[PDB]
Write a protein that binds this ligand. Structure first.
Ligand code: BCL
Ligand code: BCL
Ligand code: BCL
Ligand code: BCL
Ligand SMILES: CC[C@H]1c2cc3[nH]c4c(c3C)C(=O)[C@H](C(=O)OC)c4c3nc(cc4[nH]c(cc(n2)[C@@H]1C)c(C(C)=O)c4C)[C@@H](C)[C@@H]3CCC(=O)OC/C=C(/C)CCC[C@H](C)CCC[C@H](C)CCCC(C)C
Ligand SMILES: COC1=C(OC)C(=O)C(C/C=C(\C)CC/C=C(\C)CC/C=C(/C)CC/C=C(/C)CC/C=C(/C)CC/C=C(\C)CC/C=C(\C)CCC=C(C)C)=C(C)C1=O
Ligand SMILES: CCCCCC/C=C\CCCCCCCCCC(=O)O[C@H](COC(=O)CCCCCCCCCCCCCCC)COP(=O)(O)OC[C@@H](O)CO
Ligand SMILES: COC(C)(C)C/C=C/C(C)=C/C=C/C(C=O)=C/C=C/C(C)=C/C=C/C=C(C)/C=C/C=C(C)/C=C/C1=C(C)C[C@@H](O)CC1(C)C
Ligand SMILES: COC(C)(C)C/C=C/C(C)=C/C=C/C(C=O)=C/C=C/C(C)=C/C=C/C=C(C)/C=C/C=C(C)/C=C/C1=C(C)C[C@@H](O)CC1(C)C
Ligand SMILES: COC(C)(C)C/C=C/C(C)=C/C=C/C(C=O)=C/C=C/C(C)=C/C=C/C=C(C)/C=C/C=C(C)/C=C/C1=C(C)C[C@@H](O)CC1(C)C
Ligand SMILES: COC(C)(C)CCC/C(C)=C/C=C/C(C)=C/C=C/C(C)=C/C=C\C=C(C)\C=C\C=C(C)\C=C\C=C(/C)CCCC(C)(C)OC
Ligand SMILES: CCCCCCCCCCCCCCCCCC
Ligand SMILES: [Fe+3]
Lengths: 320, 40, 265, 44, 273, 20, 44, 44, 44, 44, 44, 40, 44, 44, 44, 40
């Protein structure tokens, strides 16, 4: 009876749109296009076309090399058995070199050399993907907000994989390539350094991840509720204020006493998302290098609880 | 304000209130110093 | 690990980020103040001075040679609204004096948008009837919607669908043209139109069902369809006209029937 | 001097000044309360 | 009528309960009947938080902890100093969150909008209710709820997680974490794309949605569109919240033991072992 | 909340369950 | 006094008052159930 | 007095009243079940 | 003094006043209940 | 001086002042209740 | 050096300068408080 | 501003208050140095 | 040399230069503070 | 045969070829550095 | 038979064939290097 | 600015303040070197 703007009732199909012309020297888009009816129910049904310049070629080739290295090490770990591969996939892992190697770049291949090679190729692929997003933004005359948002995640990735192990002089501090193995690394990292809950930057990164979930929920709900007035056409609302922008501002002003604009809300969202990984990388980098016991550090700063503040024995006993 | 007259009136009121505030704070700080000095 | 006294590197980094985040919150508030500010008094309409932390005005370089926007220079709404306060207080609501849908009060209010149509990146009108689009067609397995009956909020059949308006940029249906019993053609937003007889679960269900294929618009009644704002030029709709039509239909969820404005109790 | 009011709105300036003064005063009072030397509530 | 366009929108009607009784504003805030209920419940909850804190070992806001009653007390109403304060604050929080949802619904009706925001917030309300009402009821004791303390509920999270070995091996926990990470990536992408569209470089004009489509097709070969991105973000956030609630509700009631041992089911599938 | 008291529940857990 | 009905409507006020009375009565009854002196269900 | 039905819809009032009665009855029955004195299922 | 009603309407003022009075009364009663000295329910 | 009312609206000023006074008074009373020296409910 | 006022708005420049001075002086005072040599509150 | 004259007046006021502020800070630093030198 | 002012706006260049100088100076001062040889606050 | 260049752009082909050669050469040099037999940097 | 090129575009076919052959050759060389019998770099 | 003479004026001001700033920094560095040298 009432349309809720969740699924597109009637889809419009036509010739594929190949994109606006580039303002720089670009090689030309690879015109491989498709159409998915079920994606058109939620968003746009068009698949493609794609752009494959120098940066895309480098990124794809080096990432394929790294993924092939990890997968072939998984196959060797499984004894080349497809059934063992399937059975132990979650437990297969390409592990970093042991502590006896320090941060040496020369490790035997089966003892960590493949790990270092895969890390190098993955880093090359990620950096070239960032350069590709920068050049794609530049070719259309657009801003560099997405490159900086990606740079924040890359900062966390590089701190996890290279920068922190380099500063500690220990390859064994790096994250292994595996499904359950990198979760085990996460848990062990929390265990050896006291308790990562008491890292203030881990708490800040959690604050920003939670707040980004909150912000996307609120913003998506507001925009979909404003579909009756063209809320999703945000570019035009920003450059020509309509009743959708006014209603969106007034809803949140009446709810919580303050509001953003159709442009300011996206700045809020961008900053929350960026700050998540920025604070995460900062907190990980200082762990072990600066602070070795975060619970002790919290005790020194009067925010570490004791049993006389709260005793969790009952909660443990209930969960057994 | 825009006119110099209202600006001077505003400044006069602000200065009077500031002087009273500083006098009260000075009395309180003198009492605290006679009670528990923080220099020595 | 200590820099001096009990000061350490981690504490210094945390304090630096705390100060940066306070500055970022101030900047975000400054950005959020660009529309609708400065504030004004509820009764007299007296404009407030303005923030001490505000900077310069923002200017948007519009495409298609439309100039600059400058959202801080958008004209303030008229203080005299077609309504009267329920009680004399700064927080009382306004009861519309006449027809809220015609006068634009509450959910039926509209903004003073640009009086020219939105354009594609190459300068063609963005929202056009599907015949004027560039080889844009309805999905063959999707409802055709042409000639289907239209149901109003009072369950009356206001008329039928005579045309489909699509967005040439986003490839989406934006408006349905409805020819009423009197023969007048009006635009209805696709976001207020429920299509019946095309349920995914019903298609999955292994049944032979002759469900009636029609379009239901529960925002406004059949009579109100005769007061939908009209277009100045056929085949073209401006931003102002889009806002007018969307506000007229959106305000019906409160104003189509009196009971829609009453509490459940 | 008085010419400062040709550039600052008195309402905004006063509100900001008093917000800052409130933050400062509460911070100083809490710091004093947290010290055993200057705490005036726990002991007689 | 503070904003330059606000006055025409401030009309009567759209309330679910109360009609014209509480249909007014206080500053920017709309009140309504559910605003009155929200104010009462939230103010009482805050006052009782601080009243219980004043009875506790410290007034340090980091170390304040309003704790639930002991597990031995079961599901009974405890004395206030022995966990009853926590129970009253929990009831106040439930009432406040439900009233917030209903006030959002009333405000949505007043502005001619649908109920997307109240439902989206009700997902998080359901997550909280699962954490501190449904799970303790299923487990048989209020002592299973997390304390009302800034740093002690992190201790509750840590200890409950380690009571199951490694909580990373909960598969619903995996799904919720994946939804959270994908949501944050999507929010970064959406904010960046909108900002880059409205803040061009090189002296160019403000872009059209065709430019956003072109950018994301040149980037990764697919663009979801302006409506699709908001739909997908809402889906991701709501799924993250809902699957968080599901993952916590099943641990300790349906599944008891180490979550690591659960994955022994995979190794016993006769296809590969 | 149940119809029992916290003291009664604690006494039942101690004596009727943990003591016998 | 009766003039209170010139500013508040009886139909809405009755609903609000009865909701408040319900919550208050439930709170008082639950508080009574939590005390050994007044609990009327756990023991004879 | 039937005056009430002039100001309150009978359908909405009946639905709300029955919802409240159902919740109250379920709460009381669960509370009675929770106590050993009044539990009518665990023991003979 | 009566001129306070020139600046505050009676409806919103009464609503806010009674919300605050309810919150304060419940807070004080709960605080009294939490102490052994002023708990009027637990002992005879 | 009376001229302060040419720059500050009495309605907004009084409401802001009383909200602040309330929060400060509740903070002070709660702080006093925490200390055993000034607690007036725990002991005779 | 007065020509700088041709390039910067006086109100914004003053606000930014005062904010920076406040932040810097709070940082210095906090650093001094964190040293035993210069702490002026903990001990007599 | 635009007129050089009011810019010079603004510079005069700024210089006067800056000199007062710096003199106060210098007195405070001299007192602190006489109390607890940090170079020695 | 003066031709550099034909390529860079004076306001933007000055602001960026002073921000960079502030960051560098604070970094150097903090690094000096962390060292034992150059710390000037710990000891006499 | 030269006719291969009637179906593949020389620029794209050269870019892909040199990217592949770069990956291969880096892999081989890394593998050689991984072995003690061929590592030319660890020892004399 | 040459007619296979009526149904298959040779640009796509060549790209896919050369990618697959590179992956296969890398896999075979990796497997050989992983075995002690065929490793040609570890020992003389 | 666009006109060269404004560029010379801006350069004069910039170099004057830069030389003063560098002289202050040089005096501070010389005092530090006399206090605690970092080469030796
Ligand atoms: C026992 C477990 C520990 C714990 C140990 C850790 C450790 C260790 C870390 C975190 C980190 C985080 N923790 Mg934790 N954490 C705990 C409990 C929690 C709880 C909770 C109980 O509710 C929450 C909400 C969190 C939340 C968080 C996040 C806020 C944060 C990482 C978010 C992120 O950016 O995504 C992850 C995003 C990235 C990793 C960026 C990735 C971007 C790159 C470029 C992607 C490359 C992909 C590649 C091209 C794909 C192909 C690859 C090939 C197939 C190989 N933790 C407890 C205390 N947590 C991280 C952090 O930064 O915090 C300080 C971190 O390192
Ligand atoms: C040792 C710790 C364990 C662990 C044990 C647990 C346990 C136990 C729990 C989780 C839960 C979560 N964990 Mg875990 N978890 C671990 C490691 C991680 C890592 C990581 C990188 O290592 C990550 C990303 C996570 C992430 C997550 C999320 C999936 C989830 C928390 C989000 C949520 O619940 O939202 C839902 C949102 C809410 C519940 C909030 C609702 C908000 C309410 C309605 C509004 C509040 C209003 C407020 C009062 C207003 C005041 C504001 C102003 C004053 C006005 N965990 C490790 C292995 N984890 C929790 C979960 O899934 O359950 C829900 C869960 O209980
Ligand atoms: C050891 C301490 C002594 C004590 C020593 C003192 C001293 C000394 C003083 C007082 C003062 C006050 N004491 Mg005493 N007082 C004690 C115990 C109490 C108890 C109790 C435990 O029952 C109560 C109710 C009070 C009550 C009061 C107030 C009547 C008065 C503050 C006036 C005021 O402006 O409030 C502030 C509140 C408002 C301005 C708002 C109006 C309140 C209404 C009901 C709304 C409530 C708001 C709601 C609860 C929450 C909203 C919060 C925010 C608005 C968001 N005292 C104990 C016994 N008391 C002060 C006084 O006399 O001032 C004139 C004072 O100097
Ligand atoms: C003990 C085993 C012997 C050995 C036994 C054999 C046998 C038997 C054969 C070879 C063959 C080859 N050997 Mg041999 N070979 C050995 C060691 C080497 C070493 C080395 C580092 O020591 C190198 C560089 C090579 C090189 C080669 C190739 C020239 C050739 C396989 C290419 C191919 O099939 O085309 C497939 C690839 C393409 C058509 C396109 C690839 C072009 C791109 C630009 C080059 C990059 C390739 C690289 C794998 C890309 C990595 C990225 C991926 C995404 C992973 N061999 C050892 C010493 N070798 C085969 C041959 O002679 O011709 C077929 C063959 O039959
Ligand atoms: C999709 C699920 C996610 C989500 C959704 C989201 N959040 C939302 C919304 C949406 C769509 C709103 O519309 C709503 C809003 O209006 O924001 C402005 C809101 C909101 N999300 C909020 C918080 C929040 N959301 C959280 C989580 C999430 N929000 C999710 C991950 C978190 C987490 C992870 O903990 C926080 C803290 C608030 C900012 C706001 C809800 C406002 C509200 O509830 O108003 C009531 C008024 C009050 C004054 C609060 C009640 C006071 C209590 C009675 C006292 C305190 C009791 C509490 C239990 C103490 C315990 C605290 C300790 C744990 C420290
Ligand atoms: C595009 O459209 C959009 C916008 O603008 C157009 C947006 O602004 C927004 C909103 C988003 C933002 C402004 C960004 C910032 C938001 C963030 C970080 C998330 C929310 C988190 C926060 C900490 C914000 C604050 C949250 C709160 C709940 C504060 C609430 C505070 C108060 C005082 C509420 C008071 C109101 C009541 C209790 C109800 C009414 C009752 C009364 C007035 C009481 C009356 C009685 C008495 C006694 C006074 C969205 C989502 C959007 O999509
Ligand atoms: C949605 C949930 C509704 C729950 C019922 C409820 O919310 O109860 C309401 C408030 O309860 C409250 O917040 C306090 C609830 C405390 C629960 C413990 C009752 O409000 P009213 O009687 O209208 O007015 C109270 C008068 O003082 C006028 O101000
Ligand atoms: C690390 O932190 C610790 C440990 C605390 C150590 C460090 C502490 C530090 C660094 C503190 C620094 C503090 C500081 C650093 O400047 C403070 C400055 C305070 C100042 C300048 C206060 C000034 C107050 C002025 C007041 C109250 C004026 C009020 C005027 C009023 C209300 C006038 C009203 C008016 C009137 C009557 C009539 C109308 O016609 C016109 C009008 C005008 C409307
Ligand atoms: C690592 O960190 C530690 C440990 C702290 C070590 C390092 C510390 C470091 C690196 C510190 C560096 C500091 C620094 C590095 O430059 C500081 C500079 C400070 C300066 C330049 C202060 C200047 C102050 C000027 C003031 C207050 C001027 C006020 C003028 C006013 C209010 C004038 C008003 C006016 C008047 C009357 C009349 C009107 O007509 C015109 C108008 C104008 C309106
Ligand atoms: C760390 O924290 C602790 C531990 C607590 C320590 C620190 C504590 C600190 C720093 C506290 C600082 C407090 C502080 C720092 O200034 C307080 C100031 C309080 C003041 C200024 C209170 C003033 C009250 C004035 C009142 C109530 C006036 C009411 C007037 C009314 C209602 C008039 C109404 C009217 C009437 C009749 C007639 C109409 O015709 C006109 C009209 C006008 C409408
Ligand atoms: C089907 O079979 C085939 C083989 C065809 C395909 C197989 C595909 C499969 C099964 C692949 C599976 C892959 C999986 C499961 C991977 C999972 C990975 C996870 C979960 C990783 C998590 C985190 C990883 C991080 C953070 C890694 C970071 C690494 C970095 C940043 C490394 C940097 C290294 C550098 C810069 C190289 C330095 C080189 C040096 C020092 C020599 O010189 C500078
Ligand atoms: C009007 C309806 C308000 C409640 C909508 C549902 C909230 C979320 C339930 C999970
Ligand atoms: Fe958006």
């Amino acid at each position: 009876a009432t349309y809720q703007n969740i699924f597109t009732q009637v889809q419009v199909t036509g010739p594929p749109e190949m994109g606006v012309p580039h303002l720089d020297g670009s090689e030309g888009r690879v015109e491989l296009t498709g159409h998915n009816y079920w994606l058109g129910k939620i968003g746009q049904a068009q698949i493609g076309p794609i752009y494959l310049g120098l940066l895309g070629t480098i990124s794809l080739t080096f990432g394929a090399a790294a993924i092939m290295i990890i997968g072939l090490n998984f196959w060797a770990q499984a004894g080349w058995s497809p059934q063992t591969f399937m059975r132990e996939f979650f437990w297969l892992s390409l592990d970093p070199p042991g502590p006896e190697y320090g941060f040496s770049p020369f490790v035997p291949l089966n003892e960590g050399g493949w790990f270092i090679m895969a890390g190098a190729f993955l880093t090359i692929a990620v950096l070239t993907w960032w350069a590709r997003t920068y050049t794609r933004a530049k070719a259309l005359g657009m801003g560099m907000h997405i490159p900086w948002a990606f740079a924040s995640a890359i900062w966390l990735f590089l701190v996890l994989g290279f920068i922190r192990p380099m500063l500690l002089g220990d390859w064994s501090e790096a994250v292994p390539y595996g499904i359950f193995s990198h979760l085990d690394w996460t848990n062990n990292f929390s265990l050896r350094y006291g308790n990562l809950f008491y890292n203030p930057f881990h708490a800040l990164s959690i604050v920003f991840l939670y707040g980004s979930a909150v912000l996307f929920a609120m913003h998506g709900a507001t925009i979909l509720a404003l579909g009756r007035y063209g809320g999703e056409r945000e570019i035009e609302q920003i450059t020509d204020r309509g009743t959708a922008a006014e209603r969106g501002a007034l809803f949140w002003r009446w709810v919580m006493g303050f509001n953003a604009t159709f442009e300011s809300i996206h700045r809020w969202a961008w900053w929350f998302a960026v700050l998540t990984t920025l604070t995460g990388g900062i907190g990980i980098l200082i762990t072990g290098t600066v602070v070795d016991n975060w619970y002790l550090w919290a005790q020194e700063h009067y925010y570490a609880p004791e049993t006389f503040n709260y005793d969790p024995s009952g909660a443990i006993a209930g969960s057994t | 304000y825009l006119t110099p007259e209202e600006a001077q009136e505003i400044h006069k009121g602000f200065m009077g209130t500031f002087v009273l505030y500083v006098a009260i704070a000075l009395v309180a700080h003198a009492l605290m110093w006679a009670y528990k000095p923080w220099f020595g | 690990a200590y820099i001096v006294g009990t000061f350490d590197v981690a504490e210094l980094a945390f304090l630096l980020f705390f100060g940066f985040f306070i500055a970022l919150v101030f900047y975000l508030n400054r950005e959020s103040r660009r529309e609708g500010y400065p504030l004004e008094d509820e009764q007299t309409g007296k404009i407030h001075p303005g923030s001490l932390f505000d900077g310069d005005k923002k200017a948007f370089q519009l495409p298609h040679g439309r100039g600059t926007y400058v959202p801080e220079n958008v004209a303030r709404d008229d203080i005299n609204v077609p309504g009267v306060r329920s009680f004399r207080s700064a927080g009382a609501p306004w009861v519309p004096t006449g027809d809220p849908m015609k006068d634009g009060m509450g959910p039926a209010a509209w903004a003073n948008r640009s009086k020219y149509p939105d354009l594609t990146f190459d300068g063609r009108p963005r929202i056009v009837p599907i015949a004027q689009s560039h080889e844009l067609i309805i999905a063959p397995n999707d409802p055709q919607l042409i000639g289907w009956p239209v149901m109003a909020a009072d369950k009356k059949m206001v008329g039928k669908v005579s045309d489909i308006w699509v967005d040439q940029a986003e490839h989406m249906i934006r408006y349905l043209e409805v020819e009423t019993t009197t023969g007048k053609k009006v635009l209805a937003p696709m976001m207020v139109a429920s299509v019946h007889g095309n349920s995914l679960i019903d298609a999955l269900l292994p049944i032979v069902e002759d469900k009636p294929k029609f379009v239901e618009i529960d925002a406004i009644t059949a009579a109100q369809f005769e007061d939908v704002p009209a277009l100045e030029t056929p085949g073209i709709i401006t931003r102002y006209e889009e806002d007018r039509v969307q506000a007229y239909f959106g305000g019906g969820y409160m104003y189509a029937m009196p009971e829609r404005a009453e509490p459940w109790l | 001097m008085w010419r400062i009011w040709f550039y600052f709105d008195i309402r905004r300036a006063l509100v900001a000044l008093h917000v800052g003064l409130a933050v400062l005063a509460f911070t100083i009072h809490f710091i004093l309360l947290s010290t055993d030397r200057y705490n005036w509530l726990e002991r007689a | 009528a503070l904003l330059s366009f606000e006055r025409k929108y401030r009309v009567r009607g759209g309330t679910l309960i109360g009609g014209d009784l509480f249909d007014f504003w206080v500053g920017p805030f709309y009140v309504g009947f559910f605003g009155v209920t929200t104010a009462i419940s939230a103010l009482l909850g805050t006052a009782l938080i601080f009243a219980a804190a004043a009875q506790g070992p410290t007034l340090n806001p980091w170390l304040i902890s309003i704790n639930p009653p002991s597990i031995e007390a079961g599901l009974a109403f405890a004395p206030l100093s022995e966990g009853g304060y926590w129970q009253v604050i929990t009831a106040c929080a439930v009432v406040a969150f439900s009233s917030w949802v209903l006030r959002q619904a009333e405000i949505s009706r007043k502005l001619g909008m649908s109920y997307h925001v109240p439902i989206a917030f009700g997902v998080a309300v359901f997550a909280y209710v699962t954490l501190n009402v449904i799970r303790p009821l299923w487990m048989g004791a209020w002592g299973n709820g997390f304390p009302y303390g800034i740093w002690t509920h992190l201790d509750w999270v840590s200890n409950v997680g380690y009571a199951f070995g490694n909580f990373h091996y909960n598969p619903v926990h995996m799904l919720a974490i994946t939804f959270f990470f994908t949501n944050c990536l999507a929010l970064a992408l959406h904010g960046g794309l909108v900002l880059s569209a409205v803040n061009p470089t090189g002296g160019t004009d403000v872009k059209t949605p065709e430019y956003e489509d072109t950018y994301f097709r040149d980037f990764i070969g697919y663009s979801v569109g302006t409506l699709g991105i908001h739909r997908v973000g809402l889906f991701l956030a709501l799924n993250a919240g809902f699957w968080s609630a599901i993952c916590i509700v099943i641990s300790g009631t349906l599944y008891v033991g180490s979550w690591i041992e659960f994955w022994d089911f995979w190794k016993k599938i006769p296809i590969w072992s | 909340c149940s119809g029992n008291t916290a003291s009664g529940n604690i006494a039942a857990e101690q004596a009727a369950q943990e003591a016998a």
